[PDB]
Amino acid sequence: GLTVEDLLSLRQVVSGNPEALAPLLENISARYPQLREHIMANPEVFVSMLLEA
Amino acid sequence: RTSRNCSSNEERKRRKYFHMLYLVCLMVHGFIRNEWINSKRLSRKLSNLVPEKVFELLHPQKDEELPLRSTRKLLDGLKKCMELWQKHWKITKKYDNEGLYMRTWKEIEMSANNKRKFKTLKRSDFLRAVSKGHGDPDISVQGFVAMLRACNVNARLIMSCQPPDFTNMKIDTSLNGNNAYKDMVKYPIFWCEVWDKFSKKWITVDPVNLKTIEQVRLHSKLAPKGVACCERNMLRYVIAYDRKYGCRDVTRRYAQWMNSKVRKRRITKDDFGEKWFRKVITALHHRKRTKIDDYEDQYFFRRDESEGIPDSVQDLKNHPYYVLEQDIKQTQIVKPGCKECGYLKVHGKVGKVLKVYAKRDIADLKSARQWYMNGRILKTGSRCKKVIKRTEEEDERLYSFEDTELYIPPLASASGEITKNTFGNIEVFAPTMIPGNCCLVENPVAIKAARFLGVEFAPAVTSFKFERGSTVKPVLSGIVVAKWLREAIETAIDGIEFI
DNA sequence: TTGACTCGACATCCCCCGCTACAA
DNA sequence: ATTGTAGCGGGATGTCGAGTCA
């Protein structure tokens, strides 16, 4: 479960500006605690999510 | 006396988390870039960089009496390509900051604060870039892969993902400043592989940084060497993306010691990890298996069996295949009529040698009770394999797995009565220990339920708790009842507020 | 140069069904 | 008095950073 404004920044950092991953991921993981067990359990989900977007 | 540069298990566990998070993003970035490479608008402009003569070199006719000469022509093409790309690419930038090289945990933490300066790219600016020939070294290679692809060669994009090191336990982790940039760029993050149909191997091509083309056997020019170069480039996950949206972990090509040295640094070393990693790779692999996949796996297999025993004691901790005589656990013994599969020269004492066993020749033993907790008991007349010291003082006998056999608990009666222990429960430490005509129902209220219906049941002891005092206490996690009664119990449970 | 080894303070991984005593 | 309630794990093994030795 995640916003659509961050899902925007995240698709873009990941696709065209991964240099900037580091601070984005620092920010967002701090704003979405549950993301953590998500990412550990069901990465393939989080992946797929980044591909449509 | 104590400087002690170490962080909390909390921070450890976060770093592990962040390593995964950062990694997945990296590997997706590869996926997407590899798409953008296949851009058809781009392809059509890049084709015209490549003469017919060269084009022909990239697609030599099969030479049957000597395939080697076909590989040779293919190599000549790849070099003529490497040259004209040097020429296409006019302005080659320096990375702002670290590009996609590894960052230190501290650097990350601090990157929050200064949100710095980030242009935005998207897909057009990338395409436009590759066509003018303006960009950093990462872009340059990616274009090169575009060009080859537009010539209809099977040209992978390779990415050495450098997420932060989750084995770096250090609080302050500080780097040498001297020649920092010159040393970081010494080896590439991105490069290209190209498939030779004649020799059935993948050819390595780094047209922009090291500017060589290699057919890797045991050693590769691209794998970073020396303490300094590896602070920022720690080769762990080398990922190959192909035309058809394959995604394959090709680290074994580039890692000389994949199984001792490199494996300690991948998330892939514990079992959860491998399994997590495969999920990610599977998420990213949008094609179905080719025969090439098998020629490669065959390469990898051979690579993997020529690695052998490592040349040092530090490298045999937690090795997948191998273990020192000294690290065989107290609860392990050597499987009969086996012995060392090898020896290790111990650096820095003359003649001092260690015995190395294959992990496959070592047996794990468990005591009687220990087996029971795997739902297994001793086959009749079983000789013990070994004896140790337990704690007060007592000697606890251990047994091999084949000394033992499944416990088949008695079936329940017609009335659904379950056979109990001295304390009026049934012990279920493994699915096996659920009776055959019965099921286990786990729920804090299942006992309330069963008692209310007054159907016949028996509490499940599924484990023990340990606490202050030398005390142990059983965990009652549920109910064991006849299957016919399952539907009823589930209903009562669902309606527990109404009891 | 680099690995083996020691040493400092953490971690994991199995142990696998209790008892003394006070108080309203 | 009597009952409920509250107070009294750990030992082998393993892990990583550093400093010291050869």
Find chain B residues with C-beta within 8 A of A8's C-beta. none
Which structure tokens are listed for B302?
A: 């051979």
Residue with tokens 């980030």: B118
B9 touches strand C (CB under 7 A): yes
Q: Alpha-carbon distance B281 to B164, whole Å?
A: 19
Strand D contact nucleotides, protein CB < 7 Å: 8-19, 21-22
Q: Is B227 left (phi over 0), alpha (psi -120 to 50) or beta?
A: alpha
CB B481 within 8 A of CB B450: yes
Q: Give me the CA B450–C1' D5 separation in Å, rounded.
A: 28
Residue B437's nearest CA partner among B462, B416, B458, B455 is: B416
Burial class (CB in 10 A: 0-12, 13-18, 19+), B9: exposed
Q: Alpha-carbon distance B224 to B188, whole Å?
A: 9
Q: Alpha-carbon distance B438 to B424, whole Å?
A: 17
| Crossing angle (nearest 10°) for helices A5-16 and A43-52 | 90
List, edge to edge, every strand of the sheet that includes B472-482. Answer: B426-427, B459-466, B472-482, B438-442
CB B19 within 8 A of CB B166: yes
Cα distances (angstroms) measured from residue B15 to each of A23, B427, B487: 14, 39, 46
Q: Where are the alpha helices (DSSP H) in B234-290?
A: 251-254, 271-284
Q: Alpha-carbon distance B101 to A19, whole Å?
A: 9
CATH topology of domain B308-364: Anthopleurin-A (2.20.20)
Q: Under 8 Å CB-to-CB from B470, ≥6 apart: which residues?
A: none
Whether residues A25 and B112 touch (CB distance < 8 A) is answered with: no
- For chain B, how many helices (H) and strands (E)? 15, 22
Residue B468, CA: closest nucleotide via C1'?
D9
Which structure tokens are listed for B478?
A: 């549920």
Which residues are registered as beta bridge partners of B201? Answer: B196
Strands B438-442 and B472-482: antiparallel
CA closest to A12 among chain B residues: B122
CA closest to A35 among chain B residues: B21
Q: Is some CB atom of chain B closer than 8 A to the CB atom of A32?
A: no
Whether residues B122 and A46 touch (CB distance < 8 A) is answered with: no
Whether residues A19 and B280 touch (CB distance < 8 A) is answered with: no
Q: Give me the CA B470–C1' D8 separation in Å, rounded.
A: 9
CA B220 to chain CA centroid, nearest Å: 21
Partner residue facing A16 (CB), from B21, B122, B283: B122
Element (H, E) at B192: strand B190-196
CB B356 within 8 A of CB B326: no
Element (H, E) at B402: none
Domain spans of chain B, in order of start: 1-307, 308-364, 365-406, 407-499
Interface of B with A in 70-99 (CB under 8 A): 96-99
Q: Under 8 Å CB-to-CB from B225, ≥6 apart: which residues?
A: none
Strands B212-214 and B438-442: unpaired
Neighbouring C-beta atoms of residue B244, cutoff 10 Å: 12
Domain count, chain A: 1
Residue with tokens 């049941």: B457
Residue B457's nearest CA partner among B431, B488, B429 is: B488
Three-class DSSP category at B247: strand
Interface of A with B in 11-30 (CB under 8 A): 12-23, 25-27, 29
Which structure tokens are listed for B261?
A: 């040295």
Cα distances (angstroms) measured from residue B333 to each of B265, B328, B330, B387: 29, 7, 8, 11
DSSP for B470-492, written as a single string: S-EEEEEEEEEEEGGGHHHHHHH
Residue B223's nearest CA partner among B265, B268, B257 is: B257
CA A26 to chain CA centroid, nearest Å: 10
CB crowding B387-416: b at 16 or more within 10 Å, else e: eeeeeeeeebebbbeebbeebebeebeeeb
Nearest amino-acid residue to C18, taking CA and C1': B471
CB B235 within 8 A of CB B262: yes
Strands B426-427 and B459-466: parallel
CB B486 within 8 A of CB B439: yes
CB B24 within 8 A of CB A46: yes
Residue A52's nearest CA partner among B40, B120, B31, B119 is: B31
Find chain A residues with C-beta within 8 A of B109's C-beta. 26
Neighbouring C-beta atoms of residue B348, cutoff 10 Å: 6
Nearest amino-acid residue to D13, taking CA and C1': B329
Partner residue facing B279 (CB), from A22, A26, A43: A43
Residue B30's nearest CA partner among A15, A52, A17, A39 is: A15
Q: Alpha-carbon distance B262 to B268, whole Å?
A: 10
CATH topology of domain B365-406: Wheat Germ Agglutinin (Isolectin 2); domain 1 (3.30.60)
Method underlying the structure: X-ray
Residue B492's nearest CA partner among B374, B276, B21, B481 is: B481
CA A28 to chain CA centroid, nearest Å: 7
Q: Give me the CA B347–C1' C2 separation in Å, rounded.
A: 9
Q: What class does CATH assign to B1-307?
A: alpha beta
DSSP for B108-162, written as a single string: HHHHTT--------HHHHHHHHHHHTEE-HHHHHHHHHHHHHHTT--EEEEEEE-
Q: Give me the CA B420–C1' D5 separation in Å, rounded.
A: 30
B290 touches strand C (CB under 7 A): no
Phi/psi of residue B145, nearest 5 degrees:
-70, -40
* Cα-based torsion angle of the residue sequence B34, B37, B39, B44 in order, rounded to the nearest 10 degrees: -150
Residues of the domain holding A38: 1-53
Please name the amino acid found at residue B9.
N
Element (H, E) at B14: helix B9-37
Can you give the length of chain A in residues?
A: 53
CATH code (residue A49):
1.10.10.540
CB B436 within 8 A of CB B411: yes
DSSP for B327-368, written as a single string: GS-TTEEEPTT---SEEEE-TTSTT-EEEEEEGGGEEE-EEH
B330 touches strand C (CB under 7 A): no
- For chain A, how many helices (H) and strands (E)? 4, 0
Q: Alpha-carbon distance B280 to B28, whole Å?
A: 9
Phi/psi of residue B229, nearest 5 degrees:
-70, -30
Find chain B residues with C-beta within 8 A of A34's C-beta. none
Which structure tokens are listed for B312?
A: 């040092």
Q: Give me the CA B463–C1' D19 separation in Å, rounded.
A: 45
Which residues are registered as beta bridge partners of B240? Answer: B158, B248
DSSP conformational letter for B422: T
Neighbouring C-beta atoms of residue B468, cutoff 10 Å: 5
